Amino acid sequence: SMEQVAMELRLTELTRLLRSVLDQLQDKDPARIFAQPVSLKEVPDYLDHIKHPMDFATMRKRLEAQGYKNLHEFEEDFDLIIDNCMKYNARDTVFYRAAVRLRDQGGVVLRQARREVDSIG
Ligand SMILES: CS(=O)(=O)NC[C@@H]1CC(=O)N(C2CCCC2)C1
């Protein structure tokens, strides 16, 4: 139908916007701590602690499959990256501190993204 196609155009546009957001958020992780899944080979107990792992590469895979229907779904995954890290790692670690910095700097990006998704529709 024409309606289906119009919807898919919207989804494609959202994906375009979220691709820009994702690039901006990942730039706030210059250490690349969150670039890839936590290695279950190197951290074999990880899933005993963290029930829903997340990382930027996994987000990008879902993104390019147009798997984020709205900004809320995308933000949920971003929050998983940060929250998983701040639970597994103690406050005095480079990992926890990188997550705090990513959270703080990312808030600015996400605040304007929400306005853009709302504005453009
Ligand atoms: C690229 S990397 O920095 O080598 N690994 C990233 C993960 C993110 C995370 O929370 N990690 C903890 C460190 C203790 C075991 C799991 C390391």
From Swiss-Prot:
Provide the cross-link position: Glycyl lysine isopeptide (Lys-Gly) (interchain with G-Cter in SUMO2): 41
Which tissues is this chain's protein expressed in? Highly expressed in testis.
| Occurrences of domain Bromo (ranges) | 9-113
Q: Which superkingdom heads the taxonomic lineage of this protein's source?
A: Eukaryota
Where located? Nucleus; Chromosome
Q: How does it assemble?
A: Component of some HBO1 complex composed of KAT7/HBO1, MEAF6, ING4 and BRD1/BRPF2. Component of the MOZ/MORF complex composed at least of ING5, KAT6A, KAT6B, MEAF6 and one of BRPF1, BRD1/BRPF2 and BRPF3. Interacts (via PHD-type zinc finger domain) with unmodified histone H3. Interacts (via PWWP domain) with dimethylated and trimethylated 'Lys-79' on histone H3.
Entry function: Scaffold subunit of various histone acetyltransferase (HAT) complexes, such as the MOZ/MORF and HBO1 complexes, that acts as a regulator of hematopoiesis. Plays a key role in HBO1 complex by directing KAT7/HBO1 specificity towards histone H3 'Lys-14' acetylation (H3K14ac), thereby promoting erythroid differentiation.
Q: What is this protein called?
A: Bromodomain-containing protein 1
Give the source species: Homo sapiens
Range within the parent protein? 555 to 674 of 1058
